[PDB]
């Protein structure tokens, strides 16, 4: 076997490299240090990190959201530290339970939730500027930032755009470990079974597709590490036997193949489309479709099955039934 593909048998150490960017060189902090054990499976060097105004702002806004959520969770256990720790996963900061439409809810029924959502958004925005700016500063394209923009957009869809489109803050995602999970079921139930939403399906096909493609691509490059396949940029600019063999592996297996550059386009696209597809689904839900299962029945697509135990009429529809 190529043991190098499992771990680095002999580690190298040398002087730290710094690449100058257009601005910000004096805003890096930390003194790099090395981990021997990390160096078995990754680069041994940890740090330094760029600071900068946008990352500072991301932390300020993020910390404020975290404090708002945190202090509300604490209120939920009446400020008992031991019960906080115990009950943590079950604790949450919730959107309005009552229907006030798009009216700013009172603090005791959604208002803190809305405030947390605002600071979280400001935090993501600020981080996005960091992700985009660092690329420009180092003379790189902004591919990562466009992919990150789509993930942010999706969070905005389930957090506030869909709420705004149906006209109710009560529909937003709660903050909390189990509470954000419980939202998934309430949402799927209210909108008629998210398995019947095509965009849920497309998002999944892309997410599973990312699984498939990162397994395949990661395994492919490991299988050609012996010919320097991992040196991808110079394989793009000067095709070597590594990527000739990679392409032929696939061509011979599935009948077609990518190039070392374009396989990264496919990965970037699949990843993007997890979030694009989910967002379209969310924007259509409640706005233009109320029950996805019924929408699939209407359009001829839902499977149907025989009764196993007897078919059961709705008792509310029987003669003489109570309400």
């Amino acid at each position: 076997a190529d043991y190098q593909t499992i771990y680095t048998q002999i580690q190298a150490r040398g002087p730290h490299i710094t690449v100058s960017g257009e601005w910000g060189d004096n805003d890096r902090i930390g003194k790099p240090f090395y981990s021997y054990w990390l160096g078995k499976i990754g680069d041994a060097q940890i740090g330094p990190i760029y600071l900068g105004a946008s990352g500072i702002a991301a932390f300020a806004f993020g910390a404020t959201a975290i404090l708002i959520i945190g202090f509300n969770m604490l209120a939920e256990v009446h400020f008992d530290p031991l019960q906080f720790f115990r009950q943590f996963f079950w604790l949450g900061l919730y959107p309005p339970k009552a229907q006030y439409g798009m009216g700013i809810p009172p603090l005791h029924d959604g208002g803190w939730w809305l405030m947390a959502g605002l600071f979280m958004t400001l935090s993501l925005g600020s981080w996005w500027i960091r992700v985009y700016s660092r690329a420009r500063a180092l003379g790189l394209g902004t591919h990562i930032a466009w992919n990150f923009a789509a993930a942010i957009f999706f969070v905005l869809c389930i957090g506030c755009i869909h709420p705004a489109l149906v006209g109710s803050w009560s529909e937003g995602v709660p903050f909390g470990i189990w509470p954000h999970i419980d939202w998934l079921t309430a949402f799927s139930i209210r909108y008629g079974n998210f398995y019947y939403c095509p965009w849920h399906g497309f998002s999944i096909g892309f997410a599973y597709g990312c699984g498939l493609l990162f397994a395949a691509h990661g395994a492919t490059i490991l299988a050609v590490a012996r010919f320097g396949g991992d040196r991808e940029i110079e394989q793009i600019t000067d095709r070597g036997t590594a990527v000739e063999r990679a392409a032929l592996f696939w061509r011979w297996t599935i009948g077609f193949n990518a190039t070392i550059e374009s396989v990264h386009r496919w990965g970037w696209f699949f990843s993007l489309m997890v979030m694009v597809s989910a967002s379209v689904g969310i924007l259509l839900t409640g706005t233009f479709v109320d029950n996805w299962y019924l929408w699939c029945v209407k359009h001829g697509a839902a499977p149907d099955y025989p009764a196993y135990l007897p078919a059961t009429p709705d008792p509310a529809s029987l003669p003489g039934a109570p309400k």
């Binding site: 031991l82 790189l140 600019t237 990843s271 697509a301």
Partner: protein, 273 residues
């Protein structure tokens, strides 16, 4: 027609079984013994699906459903129209998958590359087996397996989740989902990074391995490196199923209650109850 660099690689050898008998290409596709067995299983399986579908109520592709037997048949053969088609198609699927994987090994060998791809492909085959063979064996009936239908498979997933009240609280599911998400995200990051270096814009110069590492050191304070992000990507993707498999196997054979109640191990410790 061959890729311009292809001919020099199109040599005899590298087979597992069969030697020179099936060591040829048909168009772009390598054949080999396992190409012949893949095709056989595909032909049988697909034909079986056509004939089963024609005995049901619909030709709509979304609505077609070929289902396993009733629980009461346990692990035995079922009549064709009461689960037997499904049994037959399952054996074909497994043989097609395994044939596909072993053919990938031959192609690897001929090219002198590692066997990492077919090894990685064993993970989804293993998960298929968890869902359709190992869990049904542990519960005692083929009828616990999932049906073959574009949408009907989702109806099975759905009811199975709800059989444990809220499947989201399954610890093995939480791991699987975390790996699913982090992997999608990491594929985006990796893809975007390589493209950002190769395509700076505006007739600017292509950048370097050093700019790649600088970018992430700057953004998150660590860069894993060019070879290692591929190892990582294979690890993350693989663990979607390697951890999920425990969540699936646990549900029924090792836990019969709702999943949320599983967390009473934490919540109900006398110290803080």
């Amino acid at each position: 027609a061959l890729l311009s660099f292809e001919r020099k690689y199109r040599v005899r050898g590298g087979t597992l079984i069969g030697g020179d008998l099936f060591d040829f290409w048909v168009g772009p596709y390598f054949v080999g013994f396992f190409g012949v067995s893949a095709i056989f299983f595909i032909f049988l399986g697909v034909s079986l699906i056509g004939y089963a579908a024609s005995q049901g109520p619909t030709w709509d592709p979304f609505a077609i459903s070929i289902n396993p037997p009733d629980l009461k048949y346990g692990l035995g053969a079922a009549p064709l129209l009461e689960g037997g088609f499904w049994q037959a198609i399952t054996v074909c699927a497994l043989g097609a998958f395994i044939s596909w994987m072993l053919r990938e090994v031959e192609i690897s060998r001929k090219l002198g590359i590692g066997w990492h791809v077919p090894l990685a492909f064993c993970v989804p085959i293993f998960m298929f087996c968890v869902l359709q063979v190992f869990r049904p064996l542990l519960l005692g009936s083929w009828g616990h397996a999932f049906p073959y239908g574009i949408l009907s498979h989702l109806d099975w997933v759905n009811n199975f989740g709800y059989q444990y009240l809220n499947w989201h609280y399954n610890p093995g599911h939480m791991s699987s989902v975390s790996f699913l998400f982090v992997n999608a995200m990491a594929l985006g990051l990796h893809g975007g990074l390589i493209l950002s270096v190769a395509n700076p814009g505006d007739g600017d110069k292509v950048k370097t391995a050093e700019h790649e590492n600088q970018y992430f050191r700057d953004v998150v304070g660590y860069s894993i490196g060019a070879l290692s992000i591929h190892r990582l990507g294979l690890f993350l993707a693989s663990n979607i199923f390697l951890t999920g498999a425990f969540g699936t196997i646990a549900s029924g054979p090792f836990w019969t209650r709702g999943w949320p109640e599983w967390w009473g191990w934490w919540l109900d410790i006398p110290f803080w109850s």
